[PDB]
Design an enzyme around this catalytic site. Structure first.
Site, short mmCIF file in Angstrom:
data_model
loop_
_atom_site.label_atom_id
_atom_site.label_comp_id
_atom_site.label_asym_id
_atom_site.label_seq_id
_atom_site.Cartn_x
_atom_site.Cartn_y
_atom_site.Cartn_z
N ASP A 42 1.10 -40.18 34.34
CA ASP A 42 1.03 -41.57 34.76
C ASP A 42 -0.43 -41.96 34.98
O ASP A 42 -1.12 -41.34 35.79
CB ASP A 42 1.82 -41.83 36.06
CG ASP A 42 1.79 -43.30 36.43
OD1 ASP A 42 2.54 -44.07 35.78
OD2 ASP A 42 0.98 -43.69 37.32
N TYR A 47 -7.50 -47.12 37.65
CA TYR A 47 -7.82 -45.87 38.33
C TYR A 47 -9.18 -45.34 37.91
O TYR A 47 -9.69 -44.45 38.55
CB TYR A 47 -6.73 -44.80 38.06
CG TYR A 47 -5.32 -45.20 38.50
CD1 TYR A 47 -5.06 -46.25 39.36
CD2 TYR A 47 -4.23 -44.49 38.02
CE1 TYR A 47 -3.79 -46.59 39.76
CE2 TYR A 47 -2.94 -44.85 38.40
CZ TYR A 47 -2.73 -45.90 39.25
OH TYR A 47 -1.44 -46.24 39.61
N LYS A 76 -0.91 -48.84 32.40
CA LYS A 76 -0.58 -50.08 33.01
C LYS A 76 -1.67 -51.12 32.75
O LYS A 76 -2.86 -50.80 32.83
CB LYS A 76 -0.38 -49.92 34.54
CG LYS A 76 0.39 -48.67 34.94
CD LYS A 76 0.73 -48.56 36.39
CE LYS A 76 1.24 -47.21 36.78
NZ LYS A 76 0.17 -46.21 36.95
N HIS A 109 1.14 -53.86 35.72
CA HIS A 109 0.86 -53.04 36.91
C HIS A 109 1.33 -53.71 38.19
O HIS A 109 1.93 -53.06 39.04
CB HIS A 109 -0.61 -52.71 36.94
CG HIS A 109 -1.01 -51.56 37.78
ND1 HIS A 109 -2.09 -50.77 37.48
CD2 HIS A 109 -0.45 -51.03 38.91
CE1 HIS A 109 -2.20 -49.86 38.41
NE2 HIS A 109 -1.21 -49.98 39.30
N1 LIG Z 1 2.37 -48.54 40.04
C1 LIG Z 1 1.59 -48.64 41.10
O1 LIG Z 1 1.29 -49.67 41.69
C2 LIG Z 1 1.26 -47.32 41.79
C3 LIG Z 1 0.82 -47.30 43.13
C4 LIG Z 1 0.56 -46.05 43.77
C5 LIG Z 1 0.75 -44.86 43.03
N2 LIG Z 1 1.14 -44.94 41.67
C6 LIG Z 1 1.23 -43.68 40.80
O2 LIG Z 1 1.96 -42.73 41.58
C7 LIG Z 1 1.17 -41.50 41.74
C8 LIG Z 1 1.65 -40.75 42.98
O3 LIG Z 1 1.34 -41.56 44.17
P1 LIG Z 1 0.07 -41.33 45.10
O4 LIG Z 1 -1.11 -40.81 44.34
O5 LIG Z 1 -0.11 -42.60 45.84
O6 LIG Z 1 0.49 -40.23 46.20
P2 LIG Z 1 1.51 -38.97 46.31
O7 LIG Z 1 1.78 -38.43 45.00
O8 LIG Z 1 2.61 -39.41 47.21
O9 LIG Z 1 0.58 -38.00 47.20
C9 LIG Z 1 -0.64 -37.47 46.62
C10 LIG Z 1 -1.26 -36.66 47.77
O10 LIG Z 1 -0.40 -35.56 48.07
C11 LIG Z 1 -1.11 -34.33 48.04
N3 LIG Z 1 -0.22 -33.32 47.55
C12 LIG Z 1 0.32 -33.19 46.27
N4 LIG Z 1 1.12 -32.15 46.15
C13 LIG Z 1 1.12 -31.58 47.41
C14 LIG Z 1 1.80 -30.44 47.82
N5 LIG Z 1 2.62 -29.68 47.07
N6 LIG Z 1 1.61 -30.12 49.16
C15 LIG Z 1 0.77 -30.86 49.98
N7 LIG Z 1 0.10 -31.98 49.54
C16 LIG Z 1 0.31 -32.31 48.23
C17 LIG Z 1 -2.25 -34.58 47.05
O11 LIG Z 1 -3.34 -33.72 47.38
P3 LIG Z 1 -4.30 -33.04 46.26
O12 LIG Z 1 -4.40 -33.96 45.08
O13 LIG Z 1 -5.60 -32.83 47.05
O14 LIG Z 1 -3.63 -31.69 45.91
C18 LIG Z 1 -2.62 -36.04 47.42
O15 LIG Z 1 -3.46 -36.11 48.56
C19 LIG Z 1 -0.27 -42.04 41.70
O16 LIG Z 1 -1.26 -41.05 41.54
C20 LIG Z 1 -0.15 -43.04 40.55
O17 LIG Z 1 -0.13 -42.30 39.32
C21 LIG Z 1 1.42 -46.13 41.04
O1 LIG Z 2 -2.13 -50.18 42.52
C1 LIG Z 2 -2.07 -48.87 42.38
O2 LIG Z 2 -1.60 -48.31 41.38
C2 LIG Z 2 -2.59 -48.00 43.49
O3 LIG Z 2 -3.46 -48.77 44.34
C3 LIG Z 2 -4.72 -49.11 43.85
C4 LIG Z 2 -5.42 -48.37 42.92
C5 LIG Z 2 -6.68 -48.81 42.54
F1 LIG Z 2 -7.32 -48.07 41.63
C6 LIG Z 2 -7.27 -49.96 43.05
C7 LIG Z 2 -6.55 -50.70 44.01
C8 LIG Z 2 -5.30 -50.27 44.37
C9 LIG Z 2 -4.50 -51.06 45.35
S1 LIG Z 2 -5.37 -51.74 46.59
N1 LIG Z 2 -3.23 -51.38 45.14
C10 LIG Z 2 -2.49 -52.27 46.02
C11 LIG Z 2 -2.22 -53.63 45.40
C12 LIG Z 2 -2.85 -54.11 44.24
C13 LIG Z 2 -2.52 -55.36 43.74
C14 LIG Z 2 -1.56 -56.15 44.36
BR1 LIG Z 2 -1.05 -57.82 43.71
C15 LIG Z 2 -0.94 -55.68 45.51
C16 LIG Z 2 -1.26 -54.45 46.03
F2 LIG Z 2 -0.65 -54.01 47.13
#
Ligand SMILES: NC(=O)c1ccc[n+]([C@@H]2O[C@H](COP(=O)([O-])OP(=O)(O)OC[C@H]3O[C@@H](n4cnc5c(N)ncnc54)[C@H](OP(=O)(O)O)[C@@H]3O)[C@@H](O)[C@H]2O)c1
Ligand SMILES: O=C(O)COc1cc(F)ccc1C(=S)NCc1ccc(Br)cc1F
Ligand SMILES: [Br-]
EC number: 1.1.1.21
Length: 310
Positions: A42, A47, A76, A109
């Site tokens: 993803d 990012y 995205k 996104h």
């Molecule tokens: N569509 C959107 O708007 C949106 C928004 C937010 C996220 N996303 C996608 O979703 C992905 C996942 O969400 P997220 O990055 O917010 O957070 P997450 O996956 O809920 O948590 C990531 C955190 O958990 C830690 N971690 C991972 N595996 C672990 C394990 N087995 N034990 C303990 N800690 C662990 C990682 O540490 P380390 O990396 O230091 O190991 C990192 O600090 C994102 O990276 C992105 O690709 C999309």
């Molecule tokens: O967005 C991600 O994937 C993870 O988050 C982010 C990842 C980035 F690389 C930069 C900003 C964000 C933020 S601040 N996202 C929150 C956000 C953005 C836009 C709108 Br509309 C609402 C909202 F809640």
């Protein structure tokens, strides 16, 4: 291991998240992930690390560790590219950086469009995001053209609320339904309503931040911590698994796709070892009971945008 999408393609239910993965660490993280079995990554332009993700994908394709057909790469469209004349170029830049000639899935996104320009969050002098007058339906039409040009195999949406999903489904002249809605989902934000709506419409839901995003930049010491919740720890112990493994298996058993992020090699591997145990129905219902409508992904500067989803 894969779920069938409404475009006829299969999507791996476990992928690797890349938001906050440092550019100096994410190439190795993606290489390790592919070596240990991940077949879904993803990504997103916002990012700022797609180039480095791409170096890893390309090396593993060159080394013939995996075939391109076996990978499921998601990216995205950022909010500053919701203009008819910018969507193709935005997709093409992501393709260029990822070293790909197509994406398996390309998502809007966020539903909100922002003023185009260099800044990802253009602000007015009082700190409000500056909108674009483009609406979700015209952005969707632009997405559909990417399918028809062969740049992407599937299109979808992210952070769309019920009424926004419905707006796309009711779009006059709709050509391709969204395949996926990618939304925040974990035991503190269980999303039963929106998930049941999307699933009823044949839209696959991807759960982001499944571990509660403990590295989110706006984390506060007082905030709830999934990984440290003793009730979740107890479920993990009962199954001789880690808390992260329970948090990843949970959405899998709801027929969701899940995309935990890590740059730690050991954790990347641990997080994949979730296909060999089952949470009981009682375990599932107990995890659902922890819902508190606690959202880690929200942003004050965008809350007055007409299409802000929450
Ligand atoms: N569509 C959107 O708007 C949106 C928004 C937010 C996220 N996303 C996608 O979703 C992905 C996942 O969400 P997220 O990055 O917010 O957070 P997450 O996956 O809920 O948590 C990531 C955190 O958990 C830690 N971690 C991972 N595996 C672990 C394990 N087995 N034990 C303990 N800690 C662990 C990682 O540490 P380390 O990396 O230091 O190991 C990192 O600090 C994102 O990276 C992105 O690709 C999309
Ligand atoms: O967005 C991600 O994937 C993870 O988050 C982010 C990842 C980035 F690389 C930069 C900003 C964000 C933020 S601040 N996202 C929150 C956000 C953005 C836009 C709108 Br509309 C609402 C909202 F809640
Ligand atoms: Br938004």
């Amino acid at each position: 291991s894969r779920i069938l999408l409404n475009n006829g393609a299969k999507m791996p239910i476990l992928g690797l998240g890349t938001w906050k993965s440092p550019p100096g660490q994410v190439t190795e993280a993606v290489k390790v992930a592919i070596d240990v079995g991940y077949r879904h990554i993803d990504c997103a332009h916002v990012y700022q690390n797609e180039n480095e993700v791409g170096v890893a994908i390309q090396e593993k394709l060159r080394e013939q560790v995996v075939k391109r057909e076996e990978l499921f790469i998601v990216s995205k469209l950022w909010c500053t590219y919701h203009e008819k004349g910018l969507v193709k170029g935005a997709c093409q830049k992501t393709l260029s950086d990822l070293k790909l000639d197509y994406l398996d899935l390309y998502l809007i996104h966020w539903p909100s469009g922002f003023k185009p320009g260099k800044e990802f969050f253009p602000l007015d002098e009082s700190g409000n995001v500056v909108p674009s007058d483009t609406n979700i339906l015209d952005t969707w039409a632009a997405m559909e053209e990417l399918v028809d040009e062969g740049l992407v195999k599937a299109i979808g949406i992210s952070n769309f609320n019920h009424l926004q999903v419905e707006m796309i489904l009711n779009k006059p002249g709709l050509k391709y339904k969204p395949a996926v809605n990618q939304i925040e989902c974990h035991p503190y934000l269980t999303q039963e309503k929106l998930i049941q709506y999307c699933q009823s419409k044949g839209i696959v839901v991807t759960a982001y931040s499944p571990l509660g995003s403990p590295d989110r930049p706006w984390a506060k010491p007082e905030d709830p911590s999934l990984l440290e919740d003793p009730r979740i720890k107890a479920i993990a112990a009962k199954h001789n698994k880690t808390t992260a493994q329970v948090l990843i298996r949970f959405p899998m058993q709801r027929n969701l796709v899940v995309i935990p992020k890590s740059v730690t090699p050991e954790r990347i591997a641990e997080n994949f070892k979730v296909f060999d145990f089952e949470l009981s129905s009682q375990d599932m219902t107990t995890l659902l009971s922890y819902n508190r409508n606690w959202r880690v992904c929200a942003l004050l500067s965008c809350t007055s945008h007409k299409d802000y989803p929450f």
